[PDB]
Amino acid sequence: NQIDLNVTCRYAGVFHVEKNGRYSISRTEAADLCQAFNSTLPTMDQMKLALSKGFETCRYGFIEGNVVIPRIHPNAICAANHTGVYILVTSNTSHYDTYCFNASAPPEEDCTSVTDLPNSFDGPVTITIVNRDGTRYSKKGEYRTHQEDI
């Protein structure tokens, strides 16, 4: 009973979370997951500020109201070569990664590793936070509040 969460640097508090190495998070699971990090789904303006501080990914993820990819450098296989906060318009499917926003994080780029999941609750799952530099933090718990996500 294991969940792997890959997390990025934070940019003005905004960060990306990928679950189990594939697009696997529903909109309800995304909110619960950010809540486990004492975080919320970013607003579009919080995401635009993060982008301006250096944030970019090549993965779709939820924000409040939309599914997006923040892009700085044009890349033909990331958001069809677009720059800015790219908004997904048409998709058949419902599961993506997520973005989260922690208001207590530093104001600009924070590429230190994440060593805690402070607001998870009691549960049976081994949850492992995986940083890009390979450092890991694990704890037994749960963060999903909707049965249809479990």
Ligand SMILES: O=C1Nc2ccccc2C[C@]12CCCN2
């Ligand atoms: O592909 C990856 N992306 C990533 C992004 C952020 C955090 C943790 C990871 C895991 C890593 C790097 C090494 C192999 N898997």
